[PDB]
Design a protein around this ligand. Structure first.
Ligand SMILES: Nc1nc2c(ncn2[C@@H]2O[C@H](COP(=O)(O)OP(=O)(O)O)[C@@H](O)[C@H]2O)c(=O)[nH]1
Ligand SMILES: [Mg+2]
Length: 170
């Protein structure tokens, strides 16, 4: 009656991991969300005729990974690797998040989507072609999002579900 899909949202502080997740669940842009709140959220949604229950960890910070975060990294089926298109450092940081996932999974073939968030903002410092070059090298999709306008948000999450299905029987 429902298929569970366990998703993890990672990336530098301030890129919009929480805003993206909240925009997915609540259809609202939250302007100011606690940067330290790490928690799991659930969403029921029909994707390609399948009733899915998304179990989504929105990660926050470093320093003594909770039991929960360690659990989700280990048992997570797919990862959204988020940077902001007006945050060059966040883009450069993606390498470290991908290295972490590769280590936790002992594999280069983990379901993953590269997300360039804050597409609504005029201060773009990361070109779509840069992002495309990075995702091409990793062998993953790249999608641009705005948690403010909702552009691409469903698309990122649905695409990650689809990547998981490409990798394993669900
Ligand atoms: N304009 C714009 N602001 C955003 C977007 N996503 C997040 N923000 C803002 O960016 C800041 C960081 O967002 P947050 O979701 O807390 O980042 P996190 O640390 O990655 O969870 C907040 O002030 C949000 O209001 C976006 O798509 N567009
Ligand atoms: Mg957050």
């Amino acid at each position: 009656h429902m298929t569970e899909y366990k998703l993890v949202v990672v990336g530098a502080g301030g890129v919009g991991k929480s805003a993206l997740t909240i925009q997915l669940i609540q259809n609202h842009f939250v302007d100011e969300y606690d940067p330290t709140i790490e928690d799991s959220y659930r969403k029921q949604v029909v994707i390609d005729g399948e009733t899915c229950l998304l179990d989504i960890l929105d990660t926050a910070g470093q320093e003594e990974y909770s039991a929960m975060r360690d659990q989700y990294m280990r048992t997570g089926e797919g990862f959204l690797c988020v940077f902001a298109i007006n945050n060059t450092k966040s883009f450069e940081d993606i390498h470290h998040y991908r290295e972490q996932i590769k280590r936790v999974k002992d594999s280069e073939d983990v379901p993953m989507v590269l997300v360039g968030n804050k597409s609504d903002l005029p201060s773009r410092t990361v070109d779509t072609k840069q992002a495309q070059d990075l995702a091409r090298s990793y062998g993953i999709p790249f999608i641009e999002t705005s948690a403010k306008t909702r552009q691409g948000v469903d698309d990122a999450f649905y695409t990650l579900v689809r990547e998981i299905r490409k990798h394993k029987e669900k």
